[PDB]
């Protein structure tokens, strides 16, 4: 995260760390949506252009963390994966359309003050909250600047940006399955996600029922915190059907 601040203890109990077995390293962010399911971006697991193609046995999921590198004894829980599900129509060749993946844990994790799932939006929550100008929150242990690492989880709040503006800021063809967020050059406030943060959650707090909803998944951007550029996120509600499908069937 660029231009964010240290998170408070227990501020994002659904935040998950995707960790590589060997060499041991931070790969991406992710989120806990139930006792046995983790949501992340497909590009974190599969992206041929960068020779990336991980399987269940290649990594670990670490839940309830705050510190980036310390093994937080008696607090964090480390879990193994049983199966990975990448969206059948994930478009990694062109624009990362449908950048989404589900991961099934080998055994359920027990909740605590530091581990708790986030809600998935319903049509009404999405229709009501996904509006230009409304702010969401992004969290992660990623890079602090484009071109180092934080000591503890970082957080930043960013406004959703008008579709036309998102479109006119890049050459990439953007779809209905994505939205962009960030401050404009004239707003006098900065902030963005960066390398290591992708796959992480973009959440919003409903003012109707006071719950936190994951509206997006950090998907892609061109650089980090560059003026006139914006971070792009996977539209979780537009893809909810597939999510329920996988969970209900598997």
């Amino acid at each position: 995260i660029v231009e964010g601040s240290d998170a408070e203890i227990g501020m994002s109990p659904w935040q998950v760390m995707l960790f590589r077995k060997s060499p041991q390293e931070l790969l991406c962010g992710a989120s806990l949506i139930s006792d046995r399911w983790v949501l992340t971006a497909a590009h974190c697991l599969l992206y041929p252009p960068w020779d990336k193609n991980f399987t269940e046995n290649d990594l670990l999921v670490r839940i309830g963390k705050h510190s980036r590198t310390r093994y937080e004894r008696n607090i964090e829980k480390i879990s193994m994966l049983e199966k990975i599900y990448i969206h059948p129509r994930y478009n990694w060749r062109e624009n990362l359309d449908r950048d989404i993946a589900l991961m099934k844990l080998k055994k359920p994790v027990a909740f605590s003050d530091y581990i708790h799932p986030v809600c998935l939006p319903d049509r009404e929550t999405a229709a009501s909250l996904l509006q230009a100008g409304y702010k969401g929150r992004v969290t992660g242990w990623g890079n602090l600047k484009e071109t180092g690492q934080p000591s503890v989880l970082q957080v930043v709040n960013l406004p959703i940006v008008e579709r036309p503006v998102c479109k006119d800021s890049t050459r990439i063809r953007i779809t209905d399955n994505m939205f962009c967020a960030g401050y404009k050059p004239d707003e006098g406030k900065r902030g963005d996600a960066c390398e290591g943060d992708s796959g992480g959650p973009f959440v919003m707090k409903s003012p109707f029922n006071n719950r936190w909803y994951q509206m997006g998944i950090v998907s892609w951007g061109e650089g980090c915190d560059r003026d006139g550029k914006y971070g792009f996120y996977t539209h979780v509600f537009r893809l909810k059907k597939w999510i329920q499908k996988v969970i209900d069937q598997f």
Binding site: P13, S112, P117, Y134, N157, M204
Partner: peptide
Amino acid sequence: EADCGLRPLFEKKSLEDKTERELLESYI
């Protein structure tokens, strides 16, 4: 999940975090 999105150390204790007010104020 039944109590999804309600944090043990915040919503459940009726305590607010440092910047959530910023989000709520943006929701006209």
